[PDB]
Amino acid sequence: VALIENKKAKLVLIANDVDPIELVVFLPALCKKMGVPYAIVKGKARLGTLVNQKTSAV
Amino acid sequence: AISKNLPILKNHFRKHWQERVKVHFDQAGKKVSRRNARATRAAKIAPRPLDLLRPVVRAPTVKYNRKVRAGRGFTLAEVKAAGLTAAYARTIGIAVDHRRQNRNQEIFDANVQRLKEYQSKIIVFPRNGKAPEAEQVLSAAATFPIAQPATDVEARAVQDNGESAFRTLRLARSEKKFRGIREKRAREKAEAEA
Amino acid sequence: PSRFTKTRKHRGHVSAGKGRIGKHRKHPGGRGMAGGQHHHRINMDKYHPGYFGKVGMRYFHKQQAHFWKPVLNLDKLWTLIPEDKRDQYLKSASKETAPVIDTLAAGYGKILGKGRIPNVPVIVKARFVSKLAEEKIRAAGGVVELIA
Amino acid sequence: TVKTGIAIGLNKGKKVTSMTPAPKISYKKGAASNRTKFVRSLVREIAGLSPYERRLIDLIRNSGEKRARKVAKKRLGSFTRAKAKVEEMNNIIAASRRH
Amino acid sequence: GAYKYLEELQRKKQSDVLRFLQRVRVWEYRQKNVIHRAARPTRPDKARRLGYKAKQGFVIYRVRVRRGNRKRPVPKGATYGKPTNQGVNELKYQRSLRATAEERVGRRAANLRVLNSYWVNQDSTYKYFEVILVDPQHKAIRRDARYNWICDPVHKHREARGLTATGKKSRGINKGHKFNNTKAGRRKTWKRQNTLSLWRYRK
RNA sequence: UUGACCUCAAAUCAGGUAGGAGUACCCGCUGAACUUAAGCAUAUCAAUAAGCGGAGGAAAAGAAACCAACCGGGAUUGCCUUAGUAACGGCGAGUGAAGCGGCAAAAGCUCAAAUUUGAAAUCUGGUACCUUCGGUGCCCGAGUUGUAAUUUGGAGAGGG
RNA sequence: GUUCUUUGUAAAGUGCCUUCGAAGAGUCGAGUUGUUUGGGAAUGCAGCUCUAAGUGGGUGGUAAAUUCCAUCUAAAGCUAA
RNA sequence: UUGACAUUGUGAAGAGUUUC
């Protein structure tokens, strides 16, 4: 999020299946504000594997 | 009951008070305890003199706006004015406050003088073990006493400006009375035109 | 102590000194201040008037020391001087040199006008004086300093 | 502030070398740091509004403003917060009128 | 961090999205048992600022209470005394429901020490909270400094005695003139100032 | 088909813990009446006794969303005094504090909210060994839906 | 009081310029009900209803409106005598 | 027992801008 506010972000990915969903919901608007390319995705588990972790959320 | 001419009483003893009565027969034993506590603390203290420095203070409201009192702490302002910091000071036998913002220059000066005096007046052992190895005092209530200021001279010449101080009082009273009125009134004629 | 008390002297006199007829029973005429309008009205009036009532204005959270104004008179005014120096100033009696008198440090908050003082000119440091006090000082040649 | 040296009056008190201390930042609890203004102004648009806000702005393009003040007074129990919320609603409806 | 955005969203409890979320979550918790361990918090920011740290030892339990006045447990209004103690219906319990809830989970699980609790959701019928616990037997706790004060036997059942936030609040602890009664202990004050103290050389 | 994840379960699973007692003092909760008022219902007794929960060797409270309005003081607790006062009240009976000042004793401080981002740097456990209230390695695991380092507003961070 | 290592290329503190400077919400606050208080147009507490803000907020012991001032900085927390 | 407030959502049809 700090990287986004700093516009360091080239691309953002956000898994849909979160709970508490309030952890995540605003992020699209933020990326719109900072003009960041962002996307909603599926499988935060897959993201975890992409991190060498269980679950990533982003 | 009521009986002959006597002043009227209000004695608050209707409330099972007998169960809750404290007597001080230990008035003496606790004095012993306290002397022993102080002495023993001192004995273990490594001569740090059993009380930390505390500052000189302008003594709140009117009844006691005259007096001068020992407060809690020395205002970091005055500390670094003396040329050091709060943390090192607390390691030293000093007591520091962050409240009590300095607003009075002479008190600023007085406390910094105390602190410089104390700094020059004490002797610190090295961080290593060996030192001059002792001599104890237990004051710092006293060796830096807290006196009132001089506040005047013994006698002076007369400088009669011929005025009536009494009348000055009545005038100040009437001013404090009529600030709001005359203010609103000048405002009224001012906004009147136009 | 006990032994001086009359109950040692009543021993034998049945009805220790409270009588046989009007005997010493528990709480007749009620307790404390019961009956101040009904059957003790005559002690309330006559020796305690004004007890019953409201009067005047209230003042919530009255803090005394707003009204700390201890009081002094010209009549004394001088004991403030240390006696050793007193006669010296008194004999001097100079406008070029008069003693300074801080009532406030002495523990006073207002000065009043009782008494007659010498014709010495005297310097005062005092808040809150009376017209007559200031007057008599000025007639003595002294002055006053209002202070805070 | 500027004392007179008098035991009574408007500026009663000891004429003294009045210093000034350093400022505590605890006085600045009401700060509005950039981060926070951003977060708040964003969360507003994510959240939209609440029904009493909605009713109030309708009241503001109705019914004058005074009535909306009375209403917000009923809802919050003050007049200060009422005035402030009213000003806020004017700020918002200004955006809606003129983007 | 994003916890700030999260806070500021939380503090708008009437937005449509929260209305929706509230409905889902309250229905869920209502279907659940009255007390249930939660896998993790619903307001992680809130737990974090009240001292939660996601690590081996900390726990959340979620809780329900039944949300009303406290009707006097008296048979048929038979209070047996004067008219002033004749009320039953309109009586209020001085501890908060949060306090009750904390107490009930601490009773459910006594190996743990409470830390805090917080509102999540409610309705007319119930109130819901999320409550924070520690296993002070846990080596992680005992070896981290920063919390191990709670391992002390003194902080046993600190909800039962009125030492949490809500505890210290309902117990009248705060500085100032509006707390003169019950600031440093109600019973202590009353005892102090209904005691007669008598010295040897009587003053 | 295979492999994850989230959630919830089970196990005489490995290891741990709570219960009850006591209860002078302590923190709470609940909570009367006799009584006093010369009656009595408010009020008082009483924010007590009884009833219930939970601790310690002391507790609790405590570093100010303070006291104040002075020239201002400066965590808390207790003693003296404030004061039987301001105030409360069928303004009847009665009840009734707090600041200031003196003394005792003294001590300050941590979390959240911040990108480690040129590198989870954090932690439980298991296991071998050891100088064992613990420590090194290895492994498993937790964890980014955030453990570590920094900072706590008295300030403080970033850079120079 | 002796006696060993040597932390270390790592920790702290210190000055002046600059950018800034995050600060706890079903809470605060209000209304009402009940209770309690010395607390009096409402001392605190709790229930219900309403429910905020960031040059703001709390208080300043007479309710309301207006303008100033002053003092603290809550809604998280530890702490011996 | 009766009224209001909340739980309590989405909309329609009809009666005195409203609000039955």
mmCIF file of C-alpha atoms in Angstrom, chain B:
data_model
loop_
_atom_site.group_PDB
_atom_site.id
_atom_site.type_symbol
_atom_site.label_atom_id
_atom_site.label_comp_id
_atom_site.label_asym_id
_atom_site.label_seq_id
_atom_site.Cartn_x
_atom_site.Cartn_y
_atom_site.Cartn_z
ATOM 1 C CA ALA B 1 -33.230 15.665 72.500
ATOM 2 C CA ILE B 2 -33.249 19.397 72.973
ATOM 3 C CA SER B 3 -32.296 20.979 76.261
ATOM 4 C CA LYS B 4 -31.012 24.268 77.639
ATOM 5 C CA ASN B 5 -29.225 27.065 75.772
ATOM 6 C CA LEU B 6 -26.350 25.359 74.073
ATOM 7 C CA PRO B 7 -24.731 25.638 70.665
ATOM 8 C CA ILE B 8 -26.125 23.162 68.200
ATOM 9 C CA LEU B 9 -24.122 20.076 67.322
ATOM 10 C CA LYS B 10 -23.634 17.965 64.255
ATOM 11 C CA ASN B 11 -21.998 14.724 65.359
ATOM 12 C CA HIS B 12 -21.952 12.087 62.690
ATOM 13 C CA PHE B 13 -22.229 8.917 64.737
ATOM 14 C CA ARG B 14 -25.341 7.155 63.469
ATOM 15 C CA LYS B 15 -23.599 4.864 61.107
ATOM 16 C CA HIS B 16 -21.999 1.809 62.775
ATOM 17 C CA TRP B 17 -18.821 3.802 63.293
ATOM 18 C CA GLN B 18 -17.554 1.615 66.114
ATOM 19 C CA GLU B 19 -16.531 -1.066 63.643
ATOM 20 C CA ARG B 20 -14.280 1.351 61.779
ATOM 21 C CA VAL B 21 -12.055 3.192 64.222
ATOM 22 C CA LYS B 22 -8.330 3.582 63.688
ATOM 23 C CA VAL B 23 -6.086 4.354 66.611
ATOM 24 C CA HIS B 24 -2.399 5.064 66.377
ATOM 25 C CA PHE B 25 -0.618 3.139 69.050
ATOM 26 C CA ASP B 26 1.938 2.399 66.360
ATOM 27 C CA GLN B 27 2.747 6.117 66.247
ATOM 28 C CA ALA B 28 6.067 5.095 67.768
ATOM 29 C CA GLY B 29 6.618 1.765 66.092
ATOM 30 C CA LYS B 30 6.133 3.210 62.651
ATOM 31 C CA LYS B 31 8.553 5.993 63.486
ATOM 32 C CA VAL B 32 11.056 3.278 64.318
ATOM 33 C CA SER B 33 10.184 1.516 61.097
ATOM 34 C CA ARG B 34 10.740 4.647 59.106
ATOM 35 C CA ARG B 35 14.033 5.552 60.713
ATOM 36 C CA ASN B 36 15.176 2.005 60.148
ATOM 37 C CA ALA B 37 13.988 2.096 56.560
ATOM 38 C CA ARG B 38 15.807 5.307 55.787
ATOM 39 C CA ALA B 39 18.985 4.154 57.481
ATOM 40 C CA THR B 40 18.963 0.780 55.761
ATOM 41 C CA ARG B 41 18.196 2.282 52.372
ATOM 42 C CA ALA B 42 21.092 4.657 52.883
ATOM 43 C CA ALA B 43 23.311 1.787 53.969
ATOM 44 C CA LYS B 44 22.695 -0.026 50.723
ATOM 45 C CA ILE B 45 22.493 3.179 48.725
ATOM 46 C CA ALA B 46 26.084 3.761 47.674
ATOM 47 C CA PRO B 47 26.119 7.178 49.249
ATOM 48 C CA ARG B 48 23.561 8.805 46.885
ATOM 49 C CA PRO B 49 21.929 10.924 49.522
ATOM 50 C CA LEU B 50 18.494 9.409 49.902
ATOM 51 C CA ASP B 51 16.565 12.191 48.184
ATOM 52 C CA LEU B 52 16.758 13.551 44.670
ATOM 53 C CA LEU B 53 17.025 17.214 43.888
ATOM 54 C CA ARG B 54 13.792 19.077 43.462
ATOM 55 C CA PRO B 55 13.235 22.550 42.169
ATOM 56 C CA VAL B 56 12.172 25.965 43.384
ATOM 57 C CA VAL B 57 8.601 26.929 42.680
ATOM 58 C CA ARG B 58 6.316 29.952 42.727
ATOM 59 C CA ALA B 59 3.692 28.484 45.010
ATOM 60 C CA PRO B 60 0.127 28.602 43.609
ATOM 61 C CA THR B 61 -2.953 30.536 44.488
ATOM 62 C CA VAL B 62 -3.250 33.849 46.235
ATOM 63 C CA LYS B 63 -3.040 32.600 49.812
ATOM 64 C CA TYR B 64 0.325 31.181 48.838
ATOM 65 C CA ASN B 65 1.366 33.156 45.757
ATOM 66 C CA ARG B 66 3.895 34.670 48.168
ATOM 67 C CA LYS B 67 5.657 31.558 49.371
ATOM 68 C CA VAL B 68 8.246 29.533 47.535
ATOM 69 C CA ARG B 69 8.072 25.799 47.460
ATOM 70 C CA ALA B 70 9.900 22.655 46.553
ATOM 71 C CA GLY B 71 8.262 21.107 43.509
ATOM 72 C CA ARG B 72 8.861 17.956 41.533
ATOM 73 C CA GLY B 73 10.998 18.640 38.503
ATOM 74 C CA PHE B 74 13.317 20.937 36.782
ATOM 75 C CA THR B 75 12.071 21.653 33.253
ATOM 76 C CA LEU B 76 14.186 20.138 30.501
ATOM 77 C CA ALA B 77 14.452 23.717 29.274
ATOM 78 C CA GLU B 78 16.416 24.666 32.376
ATOM 79 C CA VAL B 79 18.261 21.373 32.170
ATOM 80 C CA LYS B 80 19.757 21.898 28.746
ATOM 81 C CA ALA B 81 20.258 25.506 29.751
ATOM 82 C CA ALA B 82 22.543 24.097 32.425
ATOM 83 C CA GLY B 83 24.000 22.064 29.573
ATOM 84 C CA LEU B 84 22.856 18.450 29.844
ATOM 85 C CA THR B 85 19.889 16.137 29.386
ATOM 86 C CA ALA B 86 17.059 14.684 31.421
ATOM 87 C CA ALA B 87 18.142 11.077 31.172
ATOM 88 C CA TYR B 88 21.660 11.586 32.467
ATOM 89 C CA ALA B 89 20.201 13.876 35.080
ATOM 90 C CA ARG B 90 17.904 11.163 36.382
ATOM 91 C CA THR B 91 20.889 8.858 36.751
ATOM 92 C CA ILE B 92 22.281 11.690 38.799
ATOM 93 C CA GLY B 93 20.352 12.527 41.958
ATOM 94 C CA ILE B 94 18.028 14.829 40.059
ATOM 95 C CA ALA B 95 14.280 14.926 39.516
ATOM 96 C CA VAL B 96 12.757 16.102 36.267
ATOM 97 C CA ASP B 97 9.333 17.266 35.139
ATOM 98 C CA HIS B 98 7.953 17.851 31.662
ATOM 99 C CA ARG B 99 4.990 19.791 32.950
ATOM 100 C CA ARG B 100 5.485 23.140 34.632
ATOM 101 C CA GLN B 101 6.539 25.059 31.574
ATOM 102 C CA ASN B 102 8.997 27.799 32.464
ATOM 103 C CA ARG B 103 7.381 31.199 32.072
ATOM 104 C CA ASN B 104 9.284 33.275 34.654
ATOM 105 C CA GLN B 105 12.836 34.273 33.881
ATOM 106 C CA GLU B 106 14.094 34.541 37.439
ATOM 107 C CA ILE B 107 12.872 31.060 38.265
ATOM 108 C CA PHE B 108 14.543 29.818 35.117
ATOM 109 C CA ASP B 109 17.722 31.469 36.362
ATOM 110 C CA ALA B 110 17.389 30.213 39.918
ATOM 111 C CA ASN B 111 16.898 26.608 38.957
ATOM 112 C CA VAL B 112 19.744 26.666 36.463
ATOM 113 C CA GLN B 113 21.894 28.124 39.208
ATOM 114 C CA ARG B 114 20.871 25.294 41.517
ATOM 115 C CA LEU B 115 21.727 22.770 38.863
ATOM 116 C CA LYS B 116 25.116 24.258 38.065
ATOM 117 C CA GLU B 117 25.901 24.491 41.757
ATOM 118 C CA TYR B 118 24.943 20.859 42.250
ATOM 119 C CA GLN B 119 26.908 19.734 39.208
ATOM 120 C CA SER B 120 30.006 21.510 40.490
ATOM 121 C CA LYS B 121 29.267 20.338 44.021
ATOM 122 C CA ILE B 122 28.991 16.576 43.537
ATOM 123 C CA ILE B 123 31.527 13.901 42.720
ATOM 124 C CA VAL B 124 30.688 10.978 40.461
ATOM 125 C CA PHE B 125 32.432 7.647 40.487
ATOM 126 C CA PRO B 126 33.715 6.198 37.203
ATOM 127 C CA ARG B 127 31.746 3.682 35.238
ATOM 128 C CA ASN B 128 34.497 1.266 36.278
ATOM 129 C CA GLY B 129 34.823 -0.034 39.820
ATOM 130 C CA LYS B 130 37.523 1.932 41.618
ATOM 131 C CA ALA B 131 36.964 5.446 42.939
ATOM 132 C CA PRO B 132 37.693 7.624 46.018
ATOM 133 C CA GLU B 133 35.226 5.009 47.298
ATOM 134 C CA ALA B 134 33.068 7.127 49.651
ATOM 135 C CA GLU B 135 31.744 9.633 51.892
ATOM 136 C CA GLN B 136 28.030 9.699 52.516
ATOM 137 C CA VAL B 137 25.538 12.469 52.994
ATOM 138 C CA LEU B 138 21.760 11.966 53.218
ATOM 139 C CA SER B 139 20.614 15.570 52.688
ATOM 140 C CA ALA B 140 19.860 17.402 49.420
ATOM 141 C CA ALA B 141 16.831 18.398 51.363
ATOM 142 C CA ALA B 142 19.059 20.903 53.102
ATOM 143 C CA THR B 143 22.519 21.478 51.652
ATOM 144 C CA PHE B 144 20.770 23.233 48.776
ATOM 145 C CA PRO B 145 18.202 25.076 50.891
ATOM 146 C CA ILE B 146 15.171 26.730 49.405
ATOM 147 C CA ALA B 147 14.872 30.284 50.623
ATOM 148 C CA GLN B 148 12.490 32.975 49.673
ATOM 149 C CA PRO B 149 13.889 35.775 47.537
ATOM 150 C CA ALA B 150 15.054 39.025 49.073
ATOM 151 C CA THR B 151 12.114 40.787 47.371
ATOM 152 C CA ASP B 152 13.071 44.259 48.694
ATOM 153 C CA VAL B 153 15.498 46.334 50.770
ATOM 154 C CA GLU B 154 15.289 47.185 54.461
ATOM 155 C CA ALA B 155 14.178 50.779 53.938
ATOM 156 C CA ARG B 156 13.851 53.330 51.171
ATOM 157 C CA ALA B 157 13.233 56.999 50.595
ATOM 158 C CA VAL B 158 9.748 58.331 49.957
ATOM 159 C CA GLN B 159 8.542 59.077 46.435
ATOM 160 C CA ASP B 160 5.071 60.503 47.004
ATOM 161 C CA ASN B 161 3.352 60.797 43.643
ATOM 162 C CA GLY B 162 0.463 62.424 45.507
ATOM 163 C CA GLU B 163 -2.118 59.973 44.181
ATOM 164 C CA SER B 164 -4.945 58.138 45.953
ATOM 165 C CA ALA B 165 -4.268 54.418 45.752
ATOM 166 C CA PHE B 166 -7.701 53.791 47.269
ATOM 167 C CA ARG B 167 -9.307 55.690 44.437
ATOM 168 C CA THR B 168 -7.150 53.664 42.055
ATOM 169 C CA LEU B 169 -8.739 50.547 43.471
ATOM 170 C CA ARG B 170 -12.261 51.846 43.029
ATOM 171 C CA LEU B 171 -11.425 52.831 39.486
ATOM 172 C CA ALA B 172 -10.033 49.425 38.599
ATOM 173 C CA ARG B 173 -13.136 47.874 40.091
ATOM 174 C CA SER B 174 -15.380 50.113 38.018
ATOM 175 C CA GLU B 175 -13.353 49.395 34.886
ATOM 176 C CA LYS B 176 -13.687 45.656 35.399
ATOM 177 C CA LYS B 177 -17.357 46.390 35.981
ATOM 178 C CA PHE B 178 -17.983 48.403 32.844
ATOM 179 C CA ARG B 179 -15.660 47.003 30.185
ATOM 180 C CA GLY B 180 -18.437 45.013 28.571
ATOM 181 C CA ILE B 181 -20.943 47.849 28.688
ATOM 182 C CA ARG B 182 -18.741 50.555 27.237
ATOM 183 C CA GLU B 183 -17.350 48.110 24.689
ATOM 184 C CA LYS B 184 -20.822 47.169 23.494
ATOM 185 C CA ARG B 185 -21.801 50.838 23.602
ATOM 186 C CA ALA B 186 -18.927 52.084 21.459
ATOM 187 C CA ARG B 187 -19.731 49.174 19.153
ATOM 188 C CA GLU B 188 -23.346 50.350 19.031
ATOM 189 C CA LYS B 189 -22.663 53.932 18.008
ATOM 190 C CA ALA B 190 -19.965 52.691 15.621
ATOM 191 C CA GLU B 191 -22.308 50.312 13.805
ATOM 192 C CA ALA B 192 -25.017 52.986 14.030
ATOM 193 C CA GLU B 193 -23.256 55.166 11.430
ATOM 194 C CA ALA B 194 -23.438 53.068 9.370
#
